[PDB]
Amino acid sequence: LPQGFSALEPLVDLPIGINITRFQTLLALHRSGWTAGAAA
Amino acid sequence: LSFELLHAPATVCGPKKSTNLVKNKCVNFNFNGLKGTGVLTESNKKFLPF
Numbered sequence: 060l061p062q063g064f065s066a067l068e069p070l071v072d073l074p075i076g077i078n079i080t081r082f083q084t085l086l087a088l089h090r091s092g093w094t095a096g097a098a099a
Numbered sequence: 100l101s102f103e104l105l106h107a108p109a110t111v112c113g114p115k116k117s118t119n120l121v122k123n124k125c126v127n128f129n130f131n132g133l134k135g136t137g138v139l140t141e142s143n144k145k146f147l148p149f
């Protein structure tokens with residue numbers, strides 16, 4: 060992480076009101092089997 | 100037309116097309132169902148989209 064200060068402004072507020080207790084990350088693959096770029 | 104309440108927030112109230120705007124006659128102060136006192140005519144500050 061770079062050494063600096065950046066305040067994260069809000070973008071959109073979602074009035075869903077649901078019950079969620081988990082998360083999962085989706086990644087994208089590059090076809091040229093499959094190749095994946097450098098990400099973190 | 101059937102209505103019910105659930106866990107989702109209620110965002111159907113809307114503006115209800117109750118148009119009214121005046122700042123010169125000094126009659127009454129009310130906003131968003133919240134009354135009080137005050138006069139609002141001009142400003143120089145810049146707000147944010149949120």
Ligand SMILES: *[C@@H]1O[C@H](CO)[C@@H](O)[C@H](O)[C@H]1NC(C)=O
Nearest residue numbers: 076077078079080105106107
């Ligand atoms: C959301 O789920 C948790 C457990 O899954 C439960 O304890 C909680 O009451 C739920 N929220 C509401 C508003 O019912």
